[PDB]
């Protein structure tokens, strides 16, 4: 696989070495039994004791050596994998830091967690044990069988029977479960998604449908029914391969083919010694690769899924190459092709000017804010901040220039300070309190048990209005030239909303501001009100001008009084 | 293992015994098959090789009976693994909607996600892949030792001495690596939870520049996860060394006692040669236990997560039912008190709702409005006090009747990933399309159908991420109105809707033709239109209440609320 070989390029030489080292290790592990065979022949021959001692002690030591080398190689080779997984998880987290946010929304958090963690973990067999096992399964059977072939062909051809039956069992198992292997990661993502929504959307399930009617449980049964159909013929074949390749099955079939030869005048019982000592040894080598073929398949698919993300379009920072000025020129955008969401918008935001972007729900106003932050790339036209194209700015320069509040008060699992100080984690507690006091949430944080260290994990410590005031506290502390407020104070009561807006006016009296709000009476004082209806600028002007115009804004304003 | 016999179904306890009987029988047949080479080769090398047939026939009978036993214990282990998988998963799926909301801490939510995430083939193949070979390898050296007492008692005792060394090494290897294996699991769990936060909170992180692995919390978790991962690889070195010493110590003991007996004539030469092969069979479980020992600690953690979910504290319930399914109940609070941990939200709120009328609740942010609705809907339960539906305590009510007696509009409208219609039909899946279309029309979701390209087939994303803030709010309102339950709870339906859509939704919340007792948690004075009664809630208690005109005339806290 090119998508996999391109990913496992860095480990070319660790893998080639592991292939060679396992070739020597299995030969070292088969060496004691060649000596123990020689010890056995001389016992029948009654040779001198010191010769037997030498073969005995060398064989026991070579067992110790082989176990030490095989153990040591598995320590190194496991550590090499842990270093590649750490690096590769680093590359993924760096890539996903650059992709447009369309990648995340259409995919979900369950699929990303599978990508970063479970797909990289799926490579563990492909690096740590796939090439060791492949070489071990090739040389140890070939070395054993060829040596046993010289010893006696009659019992040797009978050893093919467990081998060929095993090959047919693994081929039939592989082709049968191959389709299920492809469907497996998608099923894991879907149930990863359903498990996540089941836990996150608990208040919904507790009222609308309950446990039995939940779509999680209906998918859960379907997943288990997929697992049973996948795992019954798979585990059913796995144990058949275990039975066929066991030492007892080799030892029994050797005796069945040897004992009749021993009883008749056709084979001496001394020539049985190689088979009974070595013939039972190579089953576990074949059994390792047979159980590993599925591990390779999940590994190669996981590599293909990882590399497919690592060549995704990256939202590049091109080298093409007034302060606080944001200009939208002929900007059009489409979340997916064929539907226009924004249609040739042209708008200019200047320092010290509060701009209100209002309109019908679904008209595209939050999408414009997302384009200014460059979560997505405009399909036409250009956006430039302080006269420089956003596609030419780097993320640090871009996000140092603009600050954002995004209408979805997402809070990260950490202290309130680790959420208020998200923009500047090194910022001191004196700034963090000052941001919160200006966002009008310090009174709430003081009453918490841990104070400013209280954790904000899953569904904890804050209500909807309080989650937003943390997010406004975060945006204040970032302290950027431009500020973008996406339905800030939507959940804030009028007493708190006035205090927060007064703070923002105080802080951003000489800063570019873009207020987005459905409540039109809260943007009565914007120097320009931009009306966005169905992805186009239908009218622009002050509050009074738009009321006199008798257009969309007059209708929305009149409809507000109910 | 001890926890798996608790999670196993009570139905399958008959099948468990059949597993235990057959797995022991296979161990005996494998040991007897190994030890049957001693008299077989002793008779094969003698002056009369024809006596080898008797032991070969016994060998064939023992090994074929192995295949029947090992195939049957594999089918039984497959069933028991999947019976445990289906049973434990369905019990977690049934219990989790009944677990108290306080149980969902960030750590416990990770535990539930991890426990639910164990549905994959790894937990299903628990018995076949771990316990069957673990029990086989743990007992086969002991069985081979006991089987050698028929050949020579001192040699059988030597093998049992090597068995004691094995179980000692097995006990010690788990003891050394357990401290590091716990930390590896903790760091890996935190890394998972931070990837999920990383993908869910991409907007906020990117604006705050905490997205790159050098500065991101997921990047730090990857560093800690890597540090604990490598530490575990190193701290498992004693386990591998100790098994290797045990395998070598047993080799010396078994081989020493074989040569001490052989030189003294108690064992012939062919018995000693056969004992080389029996030694090899006897030594294989030493290495296999080393391969299976790491998996034992992960599986112990996995079953501990599942058992943690199943032991979670379910909500109190009874078996009562309302007098009438569809009639409007009367909601009332009687000194209801509630608290999230140490913080107290309600200090004995007491009110009564007449059946069929519409009442409104307003107050400052963080006052307790969504707490009051959650107590009405049964999501929470009081620390003390009662919430009565039609005079019937919620605590004593049947879960099915309690669930069916309320439909709510949540403050933060969560939609499940899937089409738009699926989220609407969740309110009442059995409803005919005429009721579904009426539900959408009332919520102004019909406008979405016109504007959006796929209409009602619009694939919402995770949550309501692939929809506008107001669009997902309208889908949520349609879901709530579709449910025919006689109580309707509204929690900030006006937050994310423009002035035109807000007026249509507010009108339709009261214009719904079914009779219901409505509780409205609104934001604006115009959002509480057509409200029979209004309750002002502040600092966890209903400080003031009355009609809109009456409270406005009184000029109390209600009037001061709108004055800013
Ligand atoms: N991530 C997304 N994927 C697909 N479609 C989207 C996505 N986000 C928004 N849309 C669609 O784009 C159009 C406008 O979305 P947008 O979020 O810009 O709305 P809005 O005007 O900001 O809404 P509101 O005022 O309700 O917050 C709607 O059709 C919405 O369904
Ligand atoms: N999951 C939670 N864990 C701990 N405290 C919480 C939790 N949810 C809310 N609180 C606290 O409970 C009190 C009221 O919260 P609640 O959710 O009832 O607010 P609300 O009345 O809906 O307010 P808002 O207008 O902000 O939505 C506040 O102190 C809030 O911090
Ligand atoms: Mg929006
Ligand atoms: Mg609330």
PDB file of C-alpha atoms in Angstrom, chain A residues 33 36 40 43-44 60 63-64 75 78-79 82-83 86 89-90 93-94 96-99 101 104-105 108-109 112-113 116-117 191 195-211 215-217 220-221 223-224 227-228 230-232 235 238-239 243 246-247 249 251-252 255-256 259-260 262-263 269-270 272-273 276-277 280 359-362 375 396 399-400 406 408 410 412-413 421-423 425 444 448-449 457-458 463-467 469 474 487 490-494 498 518-519 556 559-560 562, chain B residues 30 37 40-41 44-45 49 53 56 59-60 63-64 67 70-71 74 78 82 89-90 93-94 96-99 101 104 106 109 112-113 116 119-121 128-129 188 191-192 194-213 215 217-218 222 225-226 230 233 237 248 251-252 269 273 276-277 281 284 343 364-366 377 379 403 406-408 410-412 414 416-418 426-427 451 462 465 468 471-472 474 479-480 483 492 494-500 502-503 523-524 526 561 564:
ATOM      1  CA  UNK A  33      17.042 -28.998  20.020  1.00  0.00           C
ATOM      2  CA  UNK A  36      19.463 -32.227  22.516  1.00  0.00           C
ATOM      3  CA  UNK A  40      19.863 -38.281  22.742  1.00  0.00           C
ATOM      4  CA  UNK A  43      22.714 -41.819  25.268  1.00  0.00           C
ATOM      5  CA  UNK A  44      21.620 -44.759  23.125  1.00  0.00           C
ATOM      6  CA  UNK A  60      20.557 -25.379  28.214  1.00  0.00           C
ATOM      7  CA  UNK A  63      17.931 -21.841  25.503  1.00  0.00           C
ATOM      8  CA  UNK A  64      18.850 -19.099  27.953  1.00  0.00           C
ATOM      9  CA  UNK A  75      11.894  -4.786  24.478  1.00  0.00           C
ATOM     10  CA  UNK A  78       8.254  -2.407  21.419  1.00  0.00           C
ATOM     11  CA  UNK A  79      10.110   0.789  22.337  1.00  0.00           C
ATOM     12  CA  UNK A  82       6.102   3.508  21.132  1.00  0.00           C
ATOM     13  CA  UNK A  83       8.390   6.200  19.715  1.00  0.00           C
ATOM     14  CA  UNK A  86       4.301   9.195  19.825  1.00  0.00           C
ATOM     15  CA  UNK A  89       0.307  11.143  17.102  1.00  0.00           C
ATOM     16  CA  UNK A  90       2.313  14.360  17.054  1.00  0.00           C
ATOM     17  CA  UNK A  93      -2.374  16.582  16.057  1.00  0.00           C
ATOM     18  CA  UNK A  94      -0.302  19.072  14.055  1.00  0.00           C
ATOM     19  CA  UNK A  96      -5.623  18.541  12.376  1.00  0.00           C
ATOM     20  CA  UNK A  97      -4.542  21.894  13.825  1.00  0.00           C
ATOM     21  CA  UNK A  98      -4.393  23.202  10.216  1.00  0.00           C
ATOM     22  CA  UNK A  99      -7.336  21.564   8.427  1.00  0.00           C
ATOM     23  CA  UNK A 101     -13.253  23.034  10.266  1.00  0.00           C
ATOM     24  CA  UNK A 104     -14.231  18.165  11.877  1.00  0.00           C
ATOM     25  CA  UNK A 105     -17.964  18.852  11.572  1.00  0.00           C
ATOM     26  CA  UNK A 108     -17.320  13.966  14.395  1.00  0.00           C
ATOM     27  CA  UNK A 109     -15.209  13.661  17.528  1.00  0.00           C
ATOM     28  CA  UNK A 112     -10.966  11.794  15.264  1.00  0.00           C
ATOM     29  CA  UNK A 113     -10.353   9.845  18.476  1.00  0.00           C
ATOM     30  CA  UNK A 116      -5.425   9.774  16.711  1.00  0.00           C
ATOM     31  CA  UNK A 117      -5.526   6.849  19.159  1.00  0.00           C
ATOM     32  CA  UNK A 191     -20.716   3.076  17.902  1.00  0.00           C
ATOM     33  CA  UNK A 195     -21.757   5.966  22.757  1.00  0.00           C
ATOM     34  CA  UNK A 196     -20.585   9.579  22.853  1.00  0.00           C
ATOM     35  CA  UNK A 197     -24.008  11.022  22.055  1.00  0.00           C
ATOM     36  CA  UNK A 198     -25.653   8.573  24.457  1.00  0.00           C
ATOM     37  CA  UNK A 199     -23.540   9.982  27.295  1.00  0.00           C
ATOM     38  CA  UNK A 200     -23.649  13.588  26.065  1.00  0.00           C
ATOM     39  CA  UNK A 201     -27.331  13.587  25.081  1.00  0.00           C
ATOM     40  CA  UNK A 202     -28.431  11.935  28.305  1.00  0.00           C
ATOM     41  CA  UNK A 203     -31.076  14.567  29.227  1.00  0.00           C
ATOM     42  CA  UNK A 204     -32.736  13.931  25.857  1.00  0.00           C
ATOM     43  CA  UNK A 205     -32.743  10.125  26.129  1.00  0.00           C
ATOM     44  CA  UNK A 206     -33.980  10.249  29.730  1.00  0.00           C
ATOM     45  CA  UNK A 207     -37.190  11.960  28.520  1.00  0.00           C
ATOM     46  CA  UNK A 208     -37.644  11.213  24.793  1.00  0.00           C
ATOM     47  CA  UNK A 209     -37.575   7.435  24.446  1.00  0.00           C
ATOM     48  CA  UNK A 210     -35.643   6.142  27.429  1.00  0.00           C
ATOM     49  CA  UNK A 211     -33.346   3.139  27.445  1.00  0.00           C
ATOM     50  CA  UNK A 215     -31.030   4.751  19.045  1.00  0.00           C
ATOM     51  CA  UNK A 216     -27.856   3.845  20.939  1.00  0.00           C
ATOM     52  CA  UNK A 217     -29.321   0.514  22.014  1.00  0.00           C
ATOM     53  CA  UNK A 220     -25.758  -1.550  20.030  1.00  0.00           C
ATOM     54  CA  UNK A 221     -27.726  -4.676  19.147  1.00  0.00           C
ATOM     55  CA  UNK A 223     -23.134  -3.905  16.375  1.00  0.00           C
ATOM     56  CA  UNK A 224     -23.182  -7.037  18.529  1.00  0.00           C
ATOM     57  CA  UNK A 227     -19.616  -8.935  15.961  1.00  0.00           C
ATOM     58  CA  UNK A 228     -21.254 -12.353  16.327  1.00  0.00           C
ATOM     59  CA  UNK A 230     -17.788 -11.616  12.271  1.00  0.00           C
ATOM     60  CA  UNK A 231     -16.384 -13.453  15.287  1.00  0.00           C
ATOM     61  CA  UNK A 232     -18.172 -16.823  15.133  1.00  0.00           C
ATOM     62  CA  UNK A 235     -12.990 -17.629  16.321  1.00  0.00           C
ATOM     63  CA  UNK A 238      -8.933 -19.661  15.060  1.00  0.00           C
ATOM     64  CA  UNK A 239      -9.392 -22.659  17.343  1.00  0.00           C
ATOM     65  CA  UNK A 243      -5.845 -27.537  17.253  1.00  0.00           C
ATOM     66  CA  UNK A 246      -0.600 -27.745  18.429  1.00  0.00           C
ATOM     67  CA  UNK A 247       2.460 -29.710  19.600  1.00  0.00           C
ATOM     68  CA  UNK A 249      -1.268 -32.784  17.047  1.00  0.00           C
ATOM     69  CA  UNK A 251       3.380 -35.308  18.183  1.00  0.00           C
ATOM     70  CA  UNK A 252       0.403 -37.606  17.633  1.00  0.00           C
ATOM     71  CA  UNK A 255       3.822 -41.229  16.238  1.00  0.00           C
ATOM     72  CA  UNK A 256       1.008 -42.478  13.990  1.00  0.00           C
ATOM     73  CA  UNK A 259       5.230 -46.234  15.293  1.00  0.00           C
ATOM     74  CA  UNK A 260       4.020 -48.508  12.444  1.00  0.00           C
ATOM     75  CA  UNK A 262       9.242 -48.768  14.032  1.00  0.00           C
ATOM     76  CA  UNK A 263       7.305 -51.994  14.620  1.00  0.00           C
ATOM     77  CA  UNK A 269      13.475 -45.725  16.596  1.00  0.00           C
ATOM     78  CA  UNK A 270      16.638 -43.597  16.836  1.00  0.00           C
ATOM     79  CA  UNK A 272      12.487 -40.608  15.344  1.00  0.00           C
ATOM     80  CA  UNK A 273      14.492 -38.394  17.714  1.00  0.00           C
ATOM     81  CA  UNK A 276       9.853 -35.742  18.388  1.00  0.00           C
ATOM     82  CA  UNK A 277      12.238 -32.984  19.514  1.00  0.00           C
ATOM     83  CA  UNK A 280       6.687 -30.239  17.537  1.00  0.00           C
ATOM     84  CA  UNK A 359     -30.837  39.016   9.831  1.00  0.00           C
ATOM     85  CA  UNK A 360     -32.958  35.872   9.596  1.00  0.00           C
ATOM     86  CA  UNK A 361     -31.844  32.674  11.276  1.00  0.00           C
ATOM     87  CA  UNK A 362     -29.743  30.600   8.918  1.00  0.00           C
ATOM     88  CA  UNK A 375     -11.860  28.323  10.256  1.00  0.00           C
ATOM     89  CA  UNK A 396      -0.237  33.269  15.376  1.00  0.00           C
ATOM     90  CA  UNK A 399      -5.302  35.136  15.874  1.00  0.00           C
ATOM     91  CA  UNK A 400      -3.192  37.794  17.564  1.00  0.00           C
ATOM     92  CA  UNK A 406     -18.470  31.928  18.952  1.00  0.00           C
ATOM     93  CA  UNK A 408     -21.256  27.883  21.435  1.00  0.00           C
ATOM     94  CA  UNK A 410     -17.372  25.382  24.605  1.00  0.00           C
ATOM     95  CA  UNK A 412     -12.222  22.737  27.989  1.00  0.00           C
ATOM     96  CA  UNK A 413     -11.782  20.163  30.752  1.00  0.00           C
ATOM     97  CA  UNK A 421      -6.501  32.034  30.409  1.00  0.00           C
ATOM     98  CA  UNK A 422      -6.814  29.818  27.332  1.00  0.00           C
ATOM     99  CA  UNK A 423      -5.460  32.486  24.968  1.00  0.00           C
ATOM    100  CA  UNK A 425      -1.834  30.289  29.476  1.00  0.00           C
ATOM    101  CA  UNK A 444     -19.756  33.319  40.560  1.00  0.00           C
ATOM    102  CA  UNK A 448     -17.112  27.953  44.005  1.00  0.00           C
ATOM    103  CA  UNK A 449     -15.438  25.505  46.425  1.00  0.00           C
ATOM    104  CA  UNK A 457     -15.186  18.913  33.088  1.00  0.00           C
ATOM    105  CA  UNK A 458     -18.108  17.220  31.361  1.00  0.00           C
ATOM    106  CA  UNK A 463     -25.092  26.964  33.519  1.00  0.00           C
ATOM    107  CA  UNK A 464     -25.633  28.301  30.016  1.00  0.00           C
ATOM    108  CA  UNK A 465     -25.449  31.968  30.904  1.00  0.00           C
ATOM    109  CA  UNK A 466     -22.397  31.325  33.073  1.00  0.00           C
ATOM    110  CA  UNK A 467     -20.626  29.290  30.380  1.00  0.00           C
ATOM    111  CA  UNK A 469     -19.566  34.767  30.492  1.00  0.00           C
ATOM    112  CA  UNK A 474     -11.514  34.469  27.658  1.00  0.00           C
ATOM    113  CA  UNK A 487     -24.396  36.119  19.910  1.00  0.00           C
ATOM    114  CA  UNK A 490     -27.620  35.580  24.308  1.00  0.00           C
ATOM    115  CA  UNK A 491     -28.271  33.818  27.633  1.00  0.00           C
ATOM    116  CA  UNK A 492     -27.357  36.821  29.809  1.00  0.00           C
ATOM    117  CA  UNK A 493     -30.221  38.503  31.639  1.00  0.00           C
ATOM    118  CA  UNK A 494     -30.706  42.250  31.008  1.00  0.00           C
ATOM    119  CA  UNK A 498     -25.886  45.731  30.332  1.00  0.00           C
ATOM    120  CA  UNK A 518     -30.686  38.605  16.897  1.00  0.00           C
ATOM    121  CA  UNK A 519     -31.977  41.002  19.565  1.00  0.00           C
ATOM    122  CA  UNK A 556     -37.832  42.205  12.062  1.00  0.00           C
ATOM    123  CA  UNK A 559     -42.097  41.686  14.647  1.00  0.00           C
ATOM    124  CA  UNK A 560     -40.058  41.887  17.859  1.00  0.00           C
ATOM    125  CA  UNK A 562     -45.201  40.405  19.322  1.00  0.00           C
TER     126      UNK A 562
ATOM    127  CA  UNK B  30      -3.134 -32.853  27.313  1.00  0.00           C
ATOM    128  CA  UNK B  37       5.102 -40.700  25.492  1.00  0.00           C
ATOM    129  CA  UNK B  40       5.245 -45.415  24.622  1.00  0.00           C
ATOM    130  CA  UNK B  41       8.890 -44.760  23.764  1.00  0.00           C
ATOM    131  CA  UNK B  44       9.159 -48.590  21.470  1.00  0.00           C
ATOM    132  CA  UNK B  45      12.895 -48.772  22.233  1.00  0.00           C
ATOM    133  CA  UNK B  49       8.358 -52.781  19.904  1.00  0.00           C
ATOM    134  CA  UNK B  53       0.581 -50.170  20.043  1.00  0.00           C
ATOM    135  CA  UNK B  56      -0.435 -45.391  20.711  1.00  0.00           C
ATOM    136  CA  UNK B  59      -2.648 -41.723  22.716  1.00  0.00           C
ATOM    137  CA  UNK B  60      -5.107 -41.532  19.824  1.00  0.00           C
ATOM    138  CA  UNK B  63      -5.879 -36.653  21.686  1.00  0.00           C
ATOM    139  CA  UNK B  64      -9.091 -37.069  19.652  1.00  0.00           C
ATOM    140  CA  UNK B  67     -10.218 -32.071  19.924  1.00  0.00           C
ATOM    141  CA  UNK B  70     -11.231 -28.134  22.948  1.00  0.00           C
ATOM    142  CA  UNK B  71     -13.747 -27.497  20.172  1.00  0.00           C
ATOM    143  CA  UNK B  74     -14.221 -23.037  22.413  1.00  0.00           C
ATOM    144  CA  UNK B  78     -17.468 -18.070  22.540  1.00  0.00           C
ATOM    145  CA  UNK B  82     -20.722 -12.990  23.853  1.00  0.00           C
ATOM    146  CA  UNK B  89     -23.680  -4.054  27.540  1.00  0.00           C
ATOM    147  CA  UNK B  90     -27.484  -4.169  27.743  1.00  0.00           C
ATOM    148  CA  UNK B  93     -27.460   0.607  28.348  1.00  0.00           C
ATOM    149  CA  UNK B  94     -30.478   0.044  30.611  1.00  0.00           C
ATOM    150  CA  UNK B  96     -27.208   4.481  32.388  1.00  0.00           C
ATOM    151  CA  UNK B  97     -30.518   6.291  31.666  1.00  0.00           C
ATOM    152  CA  UNK B  98     -31.427   5.543  35.321  1.00  0.00           C
ATOM    153  CA  UNK B  99     -28.089   6.561  36.894  1.00  0.00           C
ATOM    154  CA  UNK B 101     -26.872  12.737  37.131  1.00  0.00           C
ATOM    155  CA  UNK B 104     -21.414  11.753  35.503  1.00  0.00           C
ATOM    156  CA  UNK B 106     -15.453  13.822  33.875  1.00  0.00           C
ATOM    157  CA  UNK B 109     -17.963   9.743  31.928  1.00  0.00           C
ATOM    158  CA  UNK B 112     -18.614   4.859  30.914  1.00  0.00           C
ATOM    159  CA  UNK B 113     -17.267   5.737  27.467  1.00  0.00           C
ATOM    160  CA  UNK B 116     -19.072   1.082  26.402  1.00  0.00           C
ATOM    161  CA  UNK B 119     -17.969  -3.644  22.983  1.00  0.00           C
ATOM    162  CA  UNK B 120     -15.364  -4.487  20.328  1.00  0.00           C
ATOM    163  CA  UNK B 121     -14.049  -7.983  19.628  1.00  0.00           C
ATOM    164  CA  UNK B 128     -11.347 -17.809  24.113  1.00  0.00           C
ATOM    165  CA  UNK B 129      -8.257 -15.597  23.881  1.00  0.00           C
ATOM    166  CA  UNK B 188      -4.222   6.692  28.086  1.00  0.00           C
ATOM    167  CA  UNK B 191      -5.453  11.235  26.301  1.00  0.00           C
ATOM    168  CA  UNK B 192      -8.686   9.849  24.833  1.00  0.00           C
ATOM    169  CA  UNK B 194      -8.567  15.224  25.449  1.00  0.00           C
ATOM    170  CA  UNK B 195      -8.750  14.096  21.813  1.00  0.00           C
ATOM    171  CA  UNK B 196     -12.535  14.274  22.102  1.00  0.00           C
ATOM    172  CA  UNK B 197     -12.323  17.744  23.635  1.00  0.00           C
ATOM    173  CA  UNK B 198      -9.791  18.692  20.959  1.00  0.00           C
ATOM    174  CA  UNK B 199     -12.147  17.693  18.137  1.00  0.00           C
ATOM    175  CA  UNK B 200     -15.272  19.122  19.793  1.00  0.00           C
ATOM    176  CA  UNK B 201     -13.724  22.451  20.859  1.00  0.00           C
ATOM    177  CA  UNK B 202     -11.728  23.160  17.690  1.00  0.00           C
ATOM    178  CA  UNK B 203     -13.241  26.623  17.250  1.00  0.00           C
ATOM    179  CA  UNK B 204     -12.356  27.922  20.706  1.00  0.00           C
ATOM    180  CA  UNK B 205      -8.908  26.318  20.828  1.00  0.00           C
ATOM    181  CA  UNK B 206      -7.869  27.666  17.422  1.00  0.00           C
ATOM    182  CA  UNK B 207      -8.852  31.219  18.331  1.00  0.00           C
ATOM    183  CA  UNK B 208      -6.863  30.829  21.576  1.00  0.00           C
ATOM    184  CA  UNK B 209      -3.893  29.243  19.715  1.00  0.00           C
ATOM    185  CA  UNK B 210      -3.951  26.222  22.075  1.00  0.00           C
ATOM    186  CA  UNK B 211      -4.274  23.844  19.123  1.00  0.00           C
ATOM    187  CA  UNK B 212      -0.672  22.973  18.252  1.00  0.00           C
ATOM    188  CA  UNK B 213       0.812  20.034  20.220  1.00  0.00           C
ATOM    189  CA  UNK B 215       0.761  24.416  23.479  1.00  0.00           C
ATOM    190  CA  UNK B 217      -3.568  20.147  26.340  1.00  0.00           C
ATOM    191  CA  UNK B 218      -3.955  17.154  24.024  1.00  0.00           C
ATOM    192  CA  UNK B 222       0.345  12.761  24.472  1.00  0.00           C
ATOM    193  CA  UNK B 225       0.784   9.181  27.758  1.00  0.00           C
ATOM    194  CA  UNK B 226       4.138   8.517  26.097  1.00  0.00           C
ATOM    195  CA  UNK B 230       7.585   3.810  28.055  1.00  0.00           C
ATOM    196  CA  UNK B 233       7.591  -1.100  28.956  1.00  0.00           C
ATOM    197  CA  UNK B 237      11.304  -6.030  32.481  1.00  0.00           C
ATOM    198  CA  UNK B 248      15.210 -21.971  33.673  1.00  0.00           C
ATOM    199  CA  UNK B 251      14.397 -26.815  33.551  1.00  0.00           C
ATOM    200  CA  UNK B 252      17.292 -27.441  35.954  1.00  0.00           C
ATOM    201  CA  UNK B 269      17.541 -44.268  29.024  1.00  0.00           C
ATOM    202  CA  UNK B 273      14.811 -39.294  26.330  1.00  0.00           C
ATOM    203  CA  UNK B 276      13.112 -34.432  27.182  1.00  0.00           C
ATOM    204  CA  UNK B 277       9.990 -34.065  25.039  1.00  0.00           C
ATOM    205  CA  UNK B 281       5.786 -29.680  26.636  1.00  0.00           C
ATOM    206  CA  UNK B 284       5.864 -24.230  26.976  1.00  0.00           C
ATOM    207  CA  UNK B 343     -23.399  24.306  46.227  1.00  0.00           C
ATOM    208  CA  UNK B 364     -31.344  36.084  36.675  1.00  0.00           C
ATOM    209  CA  UNK B 365     -28.816  33.760  35.107  1.00  0.00           C
ATOM    210  CA  UNK B 366     -27.780  30.921  37.380  1.00  0.00           C
ATOM    211  CA  UNK B 377     -39.019  16.229  34.314  1.00  0.00           C
ATOM    212  CA  UNK B 379     -33.802  14.192  35.432  1.00  0.00           C
ATOM    213  CA  UNK B 403     -40.736   9.421  31.313  1.00  0.00           C
ATOM    214  CA  UNK B 406     -43.106  15.103  30.336  1.00  0.00           C
ATOM    215  CA  UNK B 407     -41.584  16.602  27.208  1.00  0.00           C
ATOM    216  CA  UNK B 408     -39.050  19.418  27.578  1.00  0.00           C
ATOM    217  CA  UNK B 410     -33.670  22.112  26.660  1.00  0.00           C
ATOM    218  CA  UNK B 411     -31.595  25.258  27.060  1.00  0.00           C
ATOM    219  CA  UNK B 412     -28.726  23.917  24.914  1.00  0.00           C
ATOM    220  CA  UNK B 414     -28.748  18.698  21.619  1.00  0.00           C
ATOM    221  CA  UNK B 416     -28.284  13.315  17.797  1.00  0.00           C
ATOM    222  CA  UNK B 417     -26.202  12.755  14.683  1.00  0.00           C
ATOM    223  CA  UNK B 418     -28.524  11.763  11.867  1.00  0.00           C
ATOM    224  CA  UNK B 426     -37.674  11.003  18.671  1.00  0.00           C
ATOM    225  CA  UNK B 427     -40.504  12.832  20.435  1.00  0.00           C
ATOM    226  CA  UNK B 451     -34.576  26.682   2.577  1.00  0.00           C
ATOM    227  CA  UNK B 462     -22.449  15.767  16.053  1.00  0.00           C
ATOM    228  CA  UNK B 465     -23.155  21.202  14.841  1.00  0.00           C
ATOM    229  CA  UNK B 468     -27.476  26.929  12.763  1.00  0.00           C
ATOM    230  CA  UNK B 471     -32.138  25.850  13.194  1.00  0.00           C
ATOM    231  CA  UNK B 472     -31.206  23.252  15.801  1.00  0.00           C
ATOM    232  CA  UNK B 474     -36.378  24.745  15.998  1.00  0.00           C
ATOM    233  CA  UNK B 479     -39.169  17.095  18.814  1.00  0.00           C
ATOM    234  CA  UNK B 480     -40.650  18.322  22.091  1.00  0.00           C
ATOM    235  CA  UNK B 483     -44.408  13.978  22.077  1.00  0.00           C
ATOM    236  CA  UNK B 492     -34.860  29.308  26.515  1.00  0.00           C
ATOM    237  CA  UNK B 494     -36.061  32.280  22.273  1.00  0.00           C
ATOM    238  CA  UNK B 495     -32.275  32.343  22.688  1.00  0.00           C
ATOM    239  CA  UNK B 496     -31.141  31.492  19.146  1.00  0.00           C
ATOM    240  CA  UNK B 497     -34.105  32.595  16.965  1.00  0.00           C
ATOM    241  CA  UNK B 498     -34.586  35.871  15.133  1.00  0.00           C
ATOM    242  CA  UNK B 499     -37.469  38.181  15.971  1.00  0.00           C
ATOM    243  CA  UNK B 500     -39.712  36.728  13.256  1.00  0.00           C
ATOM    244  CA  UNK B 502     -39.281  33.839  17.886  1.00  0.00           C
ATOM    245  CA  UNK B 503     -42.785  35.282  17.572  1.00  0.00           C
ATOM    246  CA  UNK B 523     -35.943  35.562  28.499  1.00  0.00           C
ATOM    247  CA  UNK B 524     -37.944  38.540  27.210  1.00  0.00           C
ATOM    248  CA  UNK B 526     -42.601  39.397  24.926  1.00  0.00           C
ATOM    249  CA  UNK B 561     -35.679  42.979  35.984  1.00  0.00           C
ATOM    250  CA  UNK B 564     -31.560  46.808  33.408  1.00  0.00           C
TER     251      UNK B 564
END
